[PDB]
Amino acid sequence: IQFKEKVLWTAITLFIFLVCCSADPFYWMRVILASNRGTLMELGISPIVTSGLIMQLLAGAKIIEVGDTPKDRALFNGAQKLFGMIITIGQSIVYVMCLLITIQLFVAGLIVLLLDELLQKGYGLGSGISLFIATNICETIVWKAFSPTTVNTGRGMEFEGAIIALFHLLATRTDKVRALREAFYRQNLPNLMNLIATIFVFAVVIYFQGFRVDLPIKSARYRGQYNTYPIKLFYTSNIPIILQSALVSNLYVISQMLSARFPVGGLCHYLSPPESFGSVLEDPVHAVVYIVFMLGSCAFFSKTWIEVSGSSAKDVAKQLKEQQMVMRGHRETSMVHELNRYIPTAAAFGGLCIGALSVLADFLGAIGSGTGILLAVTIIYQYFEIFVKEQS
Amino acid sequence: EDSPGLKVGPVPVLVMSLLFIASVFMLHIWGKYTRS
Amino acid sequence: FVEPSRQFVKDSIRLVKRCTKPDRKEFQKIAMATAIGFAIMGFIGFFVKLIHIPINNIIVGG
């Protein structure tokens, strides 16, 4: 109700999440998580996101459809809860084949499931799953720039390996010469330097989030009113662009040792070098074909999603027709003929930037995303303004 | 069961806290909160 | 040859010129807001380790 209330429902969920944190596991799973299950984490995000996206694929598909009833809503929620347990049992039994975390996991799937639904109702945007993604990403960038308690890459000459930190090196380094230059002792990835670059690539994405088009739009029966439609340049919410890049690399690499039952180095190498190997790379031609292949892949997931579960021609046409929208110079139908162009070209050129986040890893300190923490910051812009309006 | 449409109120907050405290403390073997 | 490639490249970078585009003060207001949000999400990793580590095990040398 109140903006004072609305923040309380966020504190509840905030502090609780703060204390808390194929035939093999998935890459993308590691991205959203940040502990890979700690001693209290008890897979706190994994089920909710796996369940929501299996179900969205099933739901979007034309075979079953969400009608306007209470009833399709109910079953979709029920369906997601049921999948969410299934995936956690499916996973967890495998690591067993020990006494402590198995018993605890069942009590911990009882907390999470209603909690996630405490911030879709108790708060506006975000979601429970969003809030968690944002925190877990922001976590692992900051811990390595302050004091990692493991090892601090870039600068070394100590083989303790267990208290080597960024602040710990800052004290020993003043008793000699600078290593805060473009010179470092072993330059694997200087971690102070990697953060400066992190915040650079953030800057070009938010620039394009300000790019969106608004339209004023009149109604049919009575022409004397005007409403609005916002057309957001981005599409598919950027989730099956980031996810689908990853999950096709799994299905090749798992299979290689599976084919043997029925070679880590060579087979991987020659099909896809992973990520960048710097501004000088490591391959004069192997890295090039990979990058060009990647952007093609990512551009293509967007153009296939929109028709079959996403929003495109028909899903937008249904929307306007309800309230009988018409165009000033034309009609209903022929807005649809201009977003036949727009939706594919905007969508997939959107994609070619969610791809050009993922290859960076030496100018980006994020654990895979991109997408998931940035959807969180866009949602802050929306809520931050709401709080400035009421205050003034 | 799944009949509730709404999922906010005092009561869900008490249920999440009550469980969260057994998870943190009761089942741990490290601090000797239960013995086997 | 393939027709569509060349035309998709046109229709994508002229439709960024139908967008309203950032103004100076408005690029500042989003750009300020970003730097706050991620310092909050910072704090998760540091504090929760002191309750975690001496409970989980005692061998750590700290």
Residue numbers in the entry:
A (entry chain A): 26 to 46, 58 to 133, 148 to 312, 337 to 466
B (entry chain B): 61 to 96
C (entry chain G): 7 to 68
The authors write:
Benefitting from these developments in direct detector technology, we obtained a subtomogram average of mainly idle mammalian ribosomes bound to the native translocon in rER vesicles at subnanometer resolution. This structure allows determining the conformation of native Sec61 in a non-inserting state, revealing an open lateral gate even in the absence of a nascent transmembrane helix, breaking with the current dogma of ER translocation. For structure determination of the ribosome-bound translocon in its native membrane environment, we applied CET and subtomogram analysis to rER vesicles isolated from canine pancreas. Notably, the density accounts for only one copy of Sec61 in addition to TRAP and OST and also extensive classification of subtomograms focused on the ribosome-bound translocon does not yield densities that might account for oligomeric states of Sec61. Fourier shell cross-resolution with a cryo-EM single particle reconstruction of the human 80S ribosome18 indicates that the resolutions of the subtomogram averages derived from either idle (12,500 subtomograms) or translocating (5,100 subtomograms) ribosome-Sec61 complexes are 9.4 and 10.0 Å, respectively. The high cross-resolution of the density segments representing Sec61 in the two subtomogram averages (10.2 Å at FSC=0.5) as well as superposition of the atomic Sec61 model described below, suggest that the idle and translocating states of Sec61 are essentially indistinguishable at the resolution range of 9–10 Å in the native translocon. The initial model, resulting from the two described rigid body fits and the adjustment of TMH10 served as an initial model for molecular dynamics flexible fitting (MDFF). Motions of the initial model during MDFF were small (root-mean squared deviation of Cα atoms <3 Å Supplementary Fig. 6d), but position helices more accurately into the density, revealing the conformation of native Sec61 in a non-inserting state. Compared with the starting model, the C-terminal domain of Sec61α and consequently the interaction with the ribosome remain largely unaltered with the exception of TMH10, which moves 13 Å towards the ribosome.
In eukaryotic cells, many proteins have to be translocated across or inserted into the endoplasmic reticulum (ER) membrane during their synthesis. These processes are facilitated by the translocon, a multi-subunit complex located in the ER membrane. The universally conserved heterotrimeric protein-conducting channel Sec61 forms the core of the translocon and binds to translating ribosomes for co-translational protein transport. On the basis of these structures, a detailed model for protein translocation through a central pore and protein membrane insertion via a lateral gate, formed by two adjacent transmembrane helices (TMHs) of Sec61α, has been proposed.
